[PDB]
Amino acid sequence: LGSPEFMSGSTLLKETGPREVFCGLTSIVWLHRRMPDAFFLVVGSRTCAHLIQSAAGVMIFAEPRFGTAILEERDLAGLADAHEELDRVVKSLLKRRPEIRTLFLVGSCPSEVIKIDLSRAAERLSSQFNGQVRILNYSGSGIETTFTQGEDGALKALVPLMPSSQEEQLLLAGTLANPVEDRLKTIFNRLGIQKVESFPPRESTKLPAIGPGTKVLLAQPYLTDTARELKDRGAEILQAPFPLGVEGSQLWIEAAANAFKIKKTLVDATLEPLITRAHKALKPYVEQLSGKKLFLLPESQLEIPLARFLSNECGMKLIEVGVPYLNREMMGPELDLLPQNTRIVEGQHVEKQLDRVREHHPDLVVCGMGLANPLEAEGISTKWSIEMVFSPIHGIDQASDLAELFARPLHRQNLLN
Amino acid sequence: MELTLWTYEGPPHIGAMRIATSMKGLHYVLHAPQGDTYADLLFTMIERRGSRPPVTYTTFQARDLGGDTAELVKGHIFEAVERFKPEALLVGESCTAELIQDQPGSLAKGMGLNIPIVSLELPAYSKKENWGASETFYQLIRGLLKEIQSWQEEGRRPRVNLLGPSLLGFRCRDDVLEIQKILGENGIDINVIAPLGASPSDLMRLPKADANVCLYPEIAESTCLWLERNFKTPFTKVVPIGVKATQDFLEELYELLGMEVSNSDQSKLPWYSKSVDSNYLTGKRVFIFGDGTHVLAAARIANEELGFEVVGIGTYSREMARKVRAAATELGLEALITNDYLEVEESIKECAPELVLGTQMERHSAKRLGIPCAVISTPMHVQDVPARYSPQMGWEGANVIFDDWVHPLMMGLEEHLIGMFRHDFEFTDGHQSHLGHLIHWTSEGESELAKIPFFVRGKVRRNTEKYARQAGCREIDGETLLDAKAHF
Amino acid sequence: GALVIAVYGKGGIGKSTTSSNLSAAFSKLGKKVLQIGCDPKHDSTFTLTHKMVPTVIDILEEVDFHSEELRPQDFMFEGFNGVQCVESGGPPAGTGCGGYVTGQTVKLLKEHHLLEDTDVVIFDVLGDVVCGGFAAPLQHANYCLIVTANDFDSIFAMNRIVAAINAKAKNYKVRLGGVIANRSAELDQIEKFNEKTGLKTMAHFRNVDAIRRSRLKKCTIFEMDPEEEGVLEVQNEYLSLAKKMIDNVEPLEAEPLKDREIFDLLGF
Amino acid sequence: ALVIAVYGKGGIGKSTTSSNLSAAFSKLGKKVLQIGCDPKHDSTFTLTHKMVPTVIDILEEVDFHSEELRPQDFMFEGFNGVQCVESGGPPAGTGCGGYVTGQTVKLLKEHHLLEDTDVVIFDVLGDVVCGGFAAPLQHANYCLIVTANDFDSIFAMNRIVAAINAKAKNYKVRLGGVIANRSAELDQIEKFNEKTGLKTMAHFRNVDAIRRSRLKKCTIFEMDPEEEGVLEVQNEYLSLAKKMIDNVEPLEAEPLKDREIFDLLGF
């Protein structure tokens, strides 16, 4: 921990040391299901291969959806041409899965350290097919990306393939659950916004068009590069907090309505029943969560909006809000909503951070699954952090469900004892 | 490069981590990039442990590559020893760290630490998990004991070491329990169980045993060999999985100890398999795959204890290759020695078995091919680390094996009824209700093929086409399918 | 336009010396030029600035490696006659990964459009191209120039680099621009190699002590005393090379020789 | 076994010096093993008059199963009995030369090749851009640094000194001294030496017979004695070898900061 900085009444610290997070390769676990017509081929080692199947291999696959081109000794010794090897591997893969429409060559620590030019390989491979299979590249390496940053890489790679258009369009960027996607679209249509599309899409071949006149709402806080690339193609990136809970979702929706100049009386008549019902639904969880001390370890960059929601709407007390990365301009609107004197730590020293957890003994510690069960054995209740990336947590109507995710382990603690 | 949809083993450092975590008082400094800490979940989620693995990762980032990554690992070695105060220290690299070559192991030995240091040289691009664990286990013991009949004369019970069991091993938790129980009933004490549960101090007691029991050769064969050369300690080579195998194992250990005289009915498998409801199990076609030890064990059980016909067999353990080939030869088969999932899938598809006895990865191919499957070996996931007592070894292990290997098969009455009547609205073709879920062929030829009762239809189609090629037959018809049947 | 040149060659052959003076030559010819040092030693451009400017990873460290906060001209520094200077930097000797650092630096400079809005970009790469990271400039260059001496080990190194250029040419626009003879009185071995490979000599520098002295004085050859021995010939030669790259340069069809072939080729 | 690692600015004459030094040791009746740690694999050809197969190529022949290899498979006899090994490495701009070199050093250590001989010379490349090319340092007793009387080589030497000092914290390796090469005078070098604590162990001038010897694929000892400079250079190599046996001492040296050496050198 170094000298503190101060922004929006809140404290920003930075810590260096041992980290316990996922590399960006793990983005495949959710991305392969958002876009089933895509395949994710990692170029790396057996470690990378082992990572993905230790994650997703608990499920049984009739058809493979991901894989690893494992670097061999000859590759490292430069005795085999990397580009010839990639071509041969991609060749025999499309034999086993001839229905692949989009192939992602995902960079790893090994491929990025020795700098295999996967991007050019992707270009050349795309050329050799071009009517059938699109081949793209993004890095999911641990040395470069943390967890959800992998999605930022994947979406950024799709951006150049988005059709060019100057049409009216509200673009929702970031992985949404299917029913959440449909719900937000329905609401947006009630406001008079007829063109609402999602990025990423459900099919890799059907990318939304982009250009000037496209307003972009960022549903996920980890789309730094994707947002920048969307802006480079003419789209306007709306600034707003993230659609978590009533407060965040309301302002997020208002941002788009303001940009489309929708009359305030209409957006109020539309959002009012949703908000009132949400406040009603939230009550039993607030009862469970109010006054509870919360401590979040860095994982996904969801920690700041989650902390904002759990304190403002559920009445939890924040001990420490850890993030693996902090885009201050992007978290701007979110930092303004946070309660005063919030302690935010960018980076991590897991051992020292653990000491801070142990000395405080929080009511609920949001942490990874490398620390969850060990903390439980120490009599410290946890909420495994990964769940929020795999749950329908966005929108006014999902506020109570989001709160339930944190109320659940506390509730279970009571039931069992 | 090697296209790998599923890897049968992890990189070798996982094997090293398995040794350090299975033990106590042994810490592990791993030079690795940020993100390799996923390995912790293998122990906290799959093995469901309530403690962090004794592993300190340097977790370097890209920004660190522009700096002193060697100083980075030195600092973590200091911190780890100071904070955790272990009896001995493992120092090693991950695949990525192996590229930048910081020599972290030799560095550790030059830092003035006053505890034993094992410098691990694991080639992540040439070797795999089990080799990693065996190498780590070997070097640690070689390092601890390098500088350095009777039980009859002392007037004490014979005592053996149990070498091999480990976390992320297959049912090691209960195999140890079962074997320890059986040995005690045979009047044989346990000296040291390692690596699982052992400290470096315990490892010092390894020569004190009258014999070494090598339960998991993939992990402990190199060590038993080293212990034999240096301390004259003999070691068993029969792994006690299966009724007959457990009997042979008992007879073997008795010889090495010099005792005299294990009954068969101590397991319930012999009676269950002898009973009449197992009559229809005779000749059911099974494919077998996994690590060497469990494949060899399963092969004898399927062939000599259950009455299955092994139609395919293989292993990913290349160090076990010659033994699997010998076993395959007895079975009249050619052994599939590979780590290529697509080759395994293909081999299963080609011989079209009624049952697959493989790893977690074989569930993938069995699902696609619609074949009843059961897991007999690592790689595994959380389902195969159950709460209940679930050994594979000894008398009770054979009981578990009987239940689990027969379970995926359609049951007797239902299988007979589907062979009799094919026009049901609920009990259709390929339906198994006990799981609680709702070159050219002529039109004449395929009609006789649909008559074949499901799971054996695959082999029938193969044999008929092989028959039609084997003769001057062109097309195929209903009669040539019946001809093929009488031919084989 | 922009003309992107990558300078490779045997270690210590004089790649940094040549690149710096060549940049100075372009600037005197009116062109605006950026020079980029691709070496952990960051000793490429110091004769242009009379100073050792902070490196790319230095600027990144000040910003805690936050991309969104990064300022473009913060790692660029003005030198002789307006020449812009950038050093990639790298780890200390014997650790880290200079290859990743250099390669990632190149990509960082490409994405920020630094290889545009200037007339001449010159990549000055280290001697031992031990990995893909140090071949990164070849992914953007129009021409590669190889510096060599009139001896075995220099020419043998040039041959290995020629093979690298040909491999890169299969997927990128980069082509061989020619050979720069340096620290040599004659060219008999060089032109022998040129004859079989199809390479051409673009410039010839003798072993000049004023050049050695100029590096010690942290200045270009153009800032040395003209009346000092050899200074005039050297200055003219750098200008001639710059003019050749503006007016005459052509993609050379070249095939490297096998190790055993160049072994039997060179000698007496 | 006296283990020596040769480092220095690229193209300063590390391979030229090493091979001739190995020859000099052998003329003194010492058994010598020279190891080329460079993808160029151009360290020992003057000792063998040819390109010897590289360790990485030999490994590739046995599909990287190193246990099938013996010293006779990758070690070759050259001038006057000197044994030679080339690590080999990837083509320029491919793979990871550091990894490869790291693996080679380990194979040699496995076969006790750093023990069963009198003198061992690691000839390493110029750009020590990663740990793989610092791998010989764990086994070396001394490190010699080759430089010329000019800014860039001395500056490069300064970086290497900092690296040697670091490793010396945990390894037995020590600075053995400086080899002045390809220079008529020593003014800038001794300016650096006095302020760092290093000393010059040998001096070789710019001699064309030396350039010619690389082209003739032979050692300076096989050159014609009546050719200018040949005898002088032979005697300087003999002297340096004599020093490493009888006179060599671990030097206490501290490198300069970038700003310091920048201002120290010059006029």
Ligand code: PMR
């Ligand atoms: C009503 C008494 C009774 C019991 C306890 C069983 C158990 C059983 N009956 Mg069945 N069975 C009973 C009755 C009948 N069975 C019948 C038929 C039958 C068949 C074809 C089969 C079978 C079977 C069984 C079995 C073995 C478990 C199984 O695979 O279903 C039990 C425990 C099964 C087998 O393997 O028999 C040897 C098999 O193929 N039963 C019929 C024909 C009308 C009757 C009345």
Ligand SMILES: Nc1ncnc2c1ncn2[C@@H]1O[C@H](COP(=O)(O)OP(=O)(O)O)[C@@H](O)[C@H]1O
């Ligand atoms: N034409 C030349 N004549 C004399 N000395 C030269 C010449 N070119 C280079 N040198 C010397 O070579 C040394 C190293 O040059 P440098 O640019 O560092 O090579 P590289 O960049 O290839 O390592 C310089 O200090 C300089 O004294």
Ligand SMILES: Nc1ncnc2c1ncn2[C@@H]1O[C@H](COP(=O)(O)OP(=O)(O)O)[C@@H](O)[C@H]1O
């Ligand atoms: N003392 C010297 N006099 C003249 N030329 C030399 C001298 N030392 C080295 N050289 C020349 O320098 C070239 C580079 O030699 P080399 O051993 O490859 O250096 P390094 O191994 O440091 O790259 C040789 O081809 C040789 O011609």
Ligand code: SF4
């Ligand atoms: S990309 Fe890096 S951090 Fe991720 S699994 Fe591979 S080696 Fe580990």
Ligand code: SF4
């Ligand atoms: S050879 Fe290149 S890629 Fe490999 S560790 Fe060294 S600098 Fe990095």
Ligand SMILES: [K+]
């Ligand atoms: K393999």
Ligand SMILES: [Mg+2]
């Ligand atoms: Mg240079």
Ligand SMILES: [Mg+2]
């Ligand atoms: Mg050399």
